């Protein structure tokens, strides 16, 4: 509600876009196309490449580094569509979300999905 208002993280949905770990996703949520919050749907290929985001957790109030990995080798799921931009930074690399992070797979460069695993604090 109201696209131009400060991100307001939550910790209870996961399928929704205001979900804490999703502070800088561009794409779609995997849980909505048979994956899980940190796992890819079947028949899909998991990348090595990723892009980071320092997301704040509302329950335990500390930020964590989320590594947004794509699952590739499929077409866009078209499911839980989201675009968040907490600290994104331009193409002059890596904090950058327009890039399709799919480096690693079968040869999977095709965007299907975005995973939201916690990689560190």
């Amino acid at each position: 509600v109201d696209p131009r208002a400060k991100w307001q993280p939550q910790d209870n949905d996961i399928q929704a876009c205001d979900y804490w770990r999703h502070c800088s996703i561009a794409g779609n949520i995997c849980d909505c196309s048979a994956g899980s919050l940190t796992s890819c749907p079947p028949g899909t290929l998991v990348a090595s490449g990723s892009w980071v985001g320092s997301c704040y957790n509302p329950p335990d109030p500390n930020k964590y580094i989320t590594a947004y990995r794509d699952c590739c080798g499929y077409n866009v799921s078209g499911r839980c569509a989201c675009l968040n931009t907490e600290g994104e930074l331009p193409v002059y690399n890596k904090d950058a979300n327009d890039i399709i992070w799919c480096f690693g797979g079968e040869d999977g460069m095709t965007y299907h999905c975005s995973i939201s695993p916690v990689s560190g604090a």
Partner: protein, 368 residues
């Protein structure tokens, strides 16, 4: 929404655990699994949804191309897809092919090419392409150039183009015999065995005036074909040995037909074999055959009696049912891009949003 259980992760975090990513695997073919295909309004590309009834969760997805035909082995051993692609997708070299996936991992276990781009592009109908009872073959229909039935063998190979009469559906009776029935010269028996092709024709059911819907219901398990008309039901029981006609029953109760009640659009019929029930999409229509319908009447296949009520609450285009002991009725809305799941004894349970574009076909495996 309850997948708001990501309170599972909150839990893991507190417990100081992992987040070790991997590709997961589908739960394993079963009775409540339902496949939703999306022809997507004629788009070069398309999608197929694998959902779990009960949960209402999508377990996976499959990608396909232009106007593909979906198939699912009843044993739950494989699911497949007949398909077409073009280099420079929409134009350029065309390629037709059969694709067969592992039902657990969703990985293509085979990719078989069809020789001269013989597919037959049409809004899909269950039954214009089918698996034979042994699941060793996949029969597919050719329209252009010459009317034909293509034989594909999953031993991974195009077998033969079985030339046939001016005839359309394909209802497999046996390993080597199928009813490419529905003709204007009503119902052909095709025997592709040994060396050749037989081709025997039935005693014409239906008259020139009775219009047979493009979407008939058939149980491969027990050769029961139920074929509604733009009004009501012609039933036939087929084995490798000739089809056998049953007495006609009208889905709509006379007064209703007067009062404009008529069949919907798309996957209008369904039949539960465990029982002998036919579900059918109706509402007050016209020449508006392909429209959505808000209701479903339940009838006894044996005794034309209406055992059932069924007001859907939504503009539904296609239906099918869980082929199990206590069946779920699947109501697919093309307009809302949602699958409304129901108790085959009225109530609405689930709903599964965003199966994007123009979802139109439900397929399920009949399994013990």
């Amino acid at each position: 929404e309850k997948s708001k259980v990501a309170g599972s992760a909150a839990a893991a975090s507190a417990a100081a655990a992992s987040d070790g990513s991997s590709c997961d695997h589908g739960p394993g073919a079963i009775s409540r699994r339902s496949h939703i295909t999306l022809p997507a309004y004629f788009a070069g590309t398309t999608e197929n949804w694998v959902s779990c009834a009960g949960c209402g969760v999508t377990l996976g997805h499959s990608l396909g191309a232009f106007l593909s035909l979906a198939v699912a082995g009843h044993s739950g051993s494989d699911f497949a897809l007949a398909s077409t692609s073009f280099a420079r997708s929409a134009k350029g070299k065309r390629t037709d092919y059969v694709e067969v996936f592992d039902p657990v991992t969703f990985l293509p276990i085979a990719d078989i090419e069809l020789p001269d781009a013989p597919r037959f592009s049409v809004g899909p109908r269950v039954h214009i392409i089918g698996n034979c009872a042994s699941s060793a073959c996949l029969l597919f229909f050719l329209f252009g150039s010459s009317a034909a039935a293509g034989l594909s063998v999953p031993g991974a190979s195009d077998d033969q183009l079985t030339k046939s009469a001016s005839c359309f559906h394909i209802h497999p009776g046996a390993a080597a015999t199928h009813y490419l029935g529905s003709c204007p010269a009503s119902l052909a028996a095709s025997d592709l065995a040994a060396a050749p092709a037989a081709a025997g024709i039935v005693g014409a059911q239906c008259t020139g005036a009775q219009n047979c819907s493009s979407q008939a219901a058939q149980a491969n398990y027990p050769g029961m074909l139920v074929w509604a008309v733009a009004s009501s039901i012609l039933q036939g029981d087929i084995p490798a040995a000739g089809a056998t006609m049953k007495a006609a029953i009208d889905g709509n109760e006379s007064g209703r037909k007067a009062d404009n009640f008529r069949s919907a659009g798309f996957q209008m019929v369904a039949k539960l074999k465990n029982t002998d029930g036919i579900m059918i999409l109706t509402v007050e229509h016209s020449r508006s055959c392909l429209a959505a319908a808000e209701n479903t009447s339940s009838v006894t296949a044996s005794v034309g009696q209406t055992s059932g009520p069924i007001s859907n609450g939504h503009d539904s285009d296609a239906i099918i049912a869980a082929q199990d002991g206590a069946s779920d009725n699947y109501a697919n809305s093309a307009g809302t891009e949602v699958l409304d799941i129901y108790d085959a004894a009225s109530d609405q349970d689930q709903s599964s949003v965003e199966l994007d574009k123009g979802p139109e076909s439900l397929s399920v495996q009949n399994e013990a």
